[PDB]
Structures are given as structure tokens and as C-alpha cells.
């Protein structure tokens, strides 16, 4: 999927995790989110479609995704030992994240 | 190693994990397939070798060896909780992604 | 952060955690390697400022970060289990690629 598909996966699964009430749809909802991220990494956003792929920008890009991954990855853990308060905290502190990228390249 | 050697190490070590008999064989054959998934990531595939390095072909390509990553993640925590046939269905879910990578650059 | 700040995070942290005697020592540690190795990603280390952001090198140095996470992470699920010197074993294992980078590219 494109990026913005890719974006709206990631934020429509981010509310369905806040609002969740069992650890299973919180699981579904963050292996949604982290196939979103990794088809993400392979985006151009509007805002850096004048450089190279490999420009500073784009990898700082990229990385980004990266570090969305790895938080995915804790939350992920946690609703798989249904620690559902925790993982939902977890996938609330995705949005520093989400907003530091959205700052430099949205 | 090249790139070769390293789809032969992913194959040899899917195949072990088909076979196996216990949690440890499943663990030692998936740790191999996850160094073997990154240092594929260094490759150029010869389909790719007259583009630029830089193109949006080559950062599709490193992104499907971290889908791969991810997914061996997950069959590699299955096998250390000594979930044998679950790590093993985790294992043979790689194949959609071997696959998706090949109609592409193989 | 830099690249020798970043470089400084990893090197602090890793001595901490071969010093530490508790398994919140060791979880503390290793979480701020994790952000230290994804912030690295993104430097040019000085020499390979004349080499294309996407050349062989680039990529090698950026996939030696990933494969130094995919260490930090084993280390980190052992200390989350509270496996300390276990953990701490694995931690040491990671100089192996702290070495074999600075070998190429420091
Ligand atoms: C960079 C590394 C990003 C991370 C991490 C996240 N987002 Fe993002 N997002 C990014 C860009 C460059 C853009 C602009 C895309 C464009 O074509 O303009 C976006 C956009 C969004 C949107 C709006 C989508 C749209 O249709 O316009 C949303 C709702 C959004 N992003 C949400 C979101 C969430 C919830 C994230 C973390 C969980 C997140 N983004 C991370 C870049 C990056
Ligand atoms: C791209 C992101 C790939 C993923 C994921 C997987 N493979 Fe692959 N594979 C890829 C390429 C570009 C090539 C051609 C290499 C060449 O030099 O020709 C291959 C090749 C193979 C082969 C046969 C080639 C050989 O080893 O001589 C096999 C058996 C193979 N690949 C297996 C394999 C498996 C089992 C995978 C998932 C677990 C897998 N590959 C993923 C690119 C990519
Ligand atoms: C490449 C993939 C690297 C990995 C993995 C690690 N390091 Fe590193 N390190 C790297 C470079 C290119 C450099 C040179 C930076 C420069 O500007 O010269 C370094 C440097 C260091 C230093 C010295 C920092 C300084 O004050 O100049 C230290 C103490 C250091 N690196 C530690 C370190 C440790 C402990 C690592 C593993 C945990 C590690 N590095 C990995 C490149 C890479
Ligand atoms: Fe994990």
C-alpha cells in the first residue's frame, strides 16, 4: 500500500487499541500496525520526493520506522502476556514517535 | 557471506525446522536464518546489480529481508518458550515472504 | 545525538552491565543502547563521508547497527526474565560486532 494507507492503518489500529477491552484485539491490532510500519519504510513522503532515496533525510526517514518498530515490539510482547493496561500504555507512548517524524517530514 | 550462500543457509535451516524434534533444533536452525537475513540485507541481487544503488528497488528489497526479521521473531520466542509446532507454523509463514521477495528480485 | 555520542551511550552502558549485580540495572542499560543504536543509524561516520549515502559501505554500516539490535534484544528479553548473568552474557557477545564495525569504518 501506499503511505497514506500505510499511516491510516497505523492510526486507525492505534484507536482500536485505546478503546480495547481484550488482549486479543490488541494483538491483532499491533501486528496490523507493525506490517504497516515495515510497508511504510519503503515509502517516499511528499515532503522528500525531491531527494535521493538515500539523501540524509530519507534515512532519518526510514530509521524512524525503526524506532516505531521496536516500541511495536514492546507493546507487542505485553499483549501477548496479556498485560493489556501495559501494552495499551506502551502503544500510547508510540505517539512521541508518531509526532517527531510527523514534525520533520508530514 | 554472498548472497547465495545466504539463501542456502534460509533454505537448509527451513527445512531442519520442518524436521525437527524439539525446541532446541528449532531455535539453533532459526538463530542461523536470522544472520543469515542480515547479512543478506548487505547484498546487491544481480536483477538489481545495473541500477543505481541508491534506487527505490534496493531500499524494497532491504525492507523484505526486516519483514523476514520480524516474522522469524516471532517463530524464534514460539520455539524458546518450547512451543514446537507453533514455532514451526511460525517457520512456514516465512515462505510468503520468501516468495514475495522472488516474483520481484529473483 | 552524534555518531561518537551515541558511540559514548553504547560504551557507558555496556560497562554498566557488566558490572551490574541486579536485573533493573541490566533492563535500564540495555534500553538506552537500544535508542543509542537506532539514533547511530542515521550518522556518517568520518570515513565514509566520501563514499554515496547508499554505497556498499553505507549499507554495511547501517545493517551493522541492525545487527547489533538484534543483540540488544536477546540481551533485554533475558533481563526482563530476570536472568542476570545470563543476560550479561549475552551483552558481552555484542563486542563482537562493536569490534568488527570499528575494524572497518573507524
Ligand atoms: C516517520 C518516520 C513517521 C512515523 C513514525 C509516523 N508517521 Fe504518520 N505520516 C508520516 C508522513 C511523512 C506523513 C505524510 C504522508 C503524506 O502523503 O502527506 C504521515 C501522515 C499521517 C497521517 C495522515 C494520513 C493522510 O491521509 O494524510 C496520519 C493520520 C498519521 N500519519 C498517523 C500516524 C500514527 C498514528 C503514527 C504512529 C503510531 C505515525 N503516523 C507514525 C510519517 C510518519
Ligand atoms: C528478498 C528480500 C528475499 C527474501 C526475503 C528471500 N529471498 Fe531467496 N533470493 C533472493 C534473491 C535476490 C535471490 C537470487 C540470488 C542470486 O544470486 O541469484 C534468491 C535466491 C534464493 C534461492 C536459490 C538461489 C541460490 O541459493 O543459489 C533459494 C533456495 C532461496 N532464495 C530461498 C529463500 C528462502 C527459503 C527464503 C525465506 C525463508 C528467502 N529465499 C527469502 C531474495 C530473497
Ligand atoms: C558500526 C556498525 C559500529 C558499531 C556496531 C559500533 N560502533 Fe563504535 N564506532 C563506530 C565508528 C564509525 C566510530 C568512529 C566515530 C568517529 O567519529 O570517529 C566509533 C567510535 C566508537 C567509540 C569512540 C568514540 C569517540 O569518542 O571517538 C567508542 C567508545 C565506541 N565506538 C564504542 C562502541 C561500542 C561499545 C560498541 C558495541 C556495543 C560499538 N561502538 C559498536 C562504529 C560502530
Ligand atoms: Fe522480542
Sequence with gaps: ADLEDNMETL?????VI??????????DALTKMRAAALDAKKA?????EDKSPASPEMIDFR???DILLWQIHDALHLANEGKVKEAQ???????????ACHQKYR
Tied chains: 1, 2, 3.
Excluded: H, I
Design 11 to 15: 492510526n486507525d489500529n492505534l484507536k
Design 18 to 27: 485505546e478503546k480495547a477491552d481484550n488482549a486479543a484485539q490488541v494483538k
Design 44 to 48: 517516499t513522503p511528499p515532503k522528500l
Design 63 to 65: 530509521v524512524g520506522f
Design 89 to 99: 500504555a506502551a502503544a500510547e507512548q508510540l505517539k512521541t514517535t508518531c509526532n
